[PDB]
Design a protein around this ligand. Structure first.
Ligand SMILES: CC(=O)N[C@@H]1[C@@H](O)[C@@H](O)[C@@H](CO)O[C@H]1O
Ligand SMILES: CC(=O)N[C@@H]1[C@@H](O)[C@@H](O)[C@@H](CO)O[C@H]1O
Ligand SMILES: CC(=O)N[C@@H]1[C@@H](O)[C@@H](O)[C@@H](CO)O[C@H]1O
Ligand SMILES: CC(=O)N[C@@H]1[C@@H](O)[C@@H](O)[C@@H](CO)O[C@H]1O
Lengths: 146, 146
């Protein structure tokens, strides 16, 4: 089931992991350009959604407020999770927000092109990334409206 | 996770529900045109896949062998599950095959446009249809190779 509380188009938010409490950032300098962060609020943690239509209905591009780049999640080349300019020019720029089967208040950030979800953990490196496999709690996210 | 054993493009198969053992049929006359059936093998139970590309990567159109129509699954209008001429003109003609979380050999027939899965049951009417909500075993299918 699609997450029932997806922010309206253009509404700004942070993406915060339910369990770690870390947020995603998307920047243009100093790789990794997309990663998780535990610290003060920076503008590169702010996102809006571009609503997919037609073949992209129920998918969304995740766009950076300060730099305008959208996220991608792929398995073909490094970096696997990154950003790129535009408004979702490429297939792997498009994400589905899938409500958790148990916790109705959180969702997975799912990529149709790559069949992956984003995760945030405190355990094994890489501590942030994408993943194809079983459901784990470290794949659960919140929209944090600002 | 996408079902790892999706038939090659153009290969013929039946869609049989794991629990009821009923198969889907798709015909042009006598409604319901798409429904479940408990009985002998007939041509209107035979399907092939059109492989989606580009924005439809990891999605598939399900085409009927004897009549050439593709399936649809929608919540907008009755019939909710049906067929239509073409090769996938509409977004509700496009399906993802999502492996079950527990049973690696079965999958849900998921529609991105409508956020529904197909089900087959012996209990309440309608005994075949689509559904937006929790995971139930009556939503599990096999590709039956012919
Ligand atoms: C002083 C400095 O570089 N701090 C960076 C900041 O620029 C921002 O990218 C943040 C993630 O929101 O990560 C921090 O490590
Ligand atoms: C053994 C191990 O590292 N397991 C992790 C699992 O805990 C979870 O983090 C998942 C990503 O959601 O990735 C797996 O590789
Ligand atoms: C005008 C209208 O309703 N168009 C629908 C279309 O949206 C789609 O549901 C299709 C089945 O793939 O059936 C059509 O009748
Ligand atoms: C309350 C109720 O009847 N729930 C059913 C559920 O058991 C299952 O059959 C599902 C289809 O997967 O449809 C639901 O309407």
């Amino acid at each position: 089931v699609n997450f029932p509380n997806i922010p309206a188009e253009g509404v700004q938010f942070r993406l915060r992991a339910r369990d770690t409490g870390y947020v995603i950032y998307s920047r243009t300098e100093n790789p990794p350009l997309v990663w998780q962060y535990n610290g003060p609020p920076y503008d590169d943690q702010l996102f809006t959604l571009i609503y997919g239509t037609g073949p992209r209905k129920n998918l969304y591009a995740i766009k950076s407020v300060p730099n305008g780049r959208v996220l991608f999640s792929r398995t073909s080349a490094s970096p696997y999770v990154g950003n790129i300019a535009g408004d979702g020019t490429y297939n792997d720029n498009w994400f589905q927000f899938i409500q958790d089967d148990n916790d109705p208040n959180s969702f997975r950030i799912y990529n149709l092109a790559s069949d992956t979800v984003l995760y945030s953990r405190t355990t094994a490196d890489p501590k942030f990334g994408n993943f194809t496999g079983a459901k784990y709690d470290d794949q659960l996210w919140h929209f944090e409206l600002v």
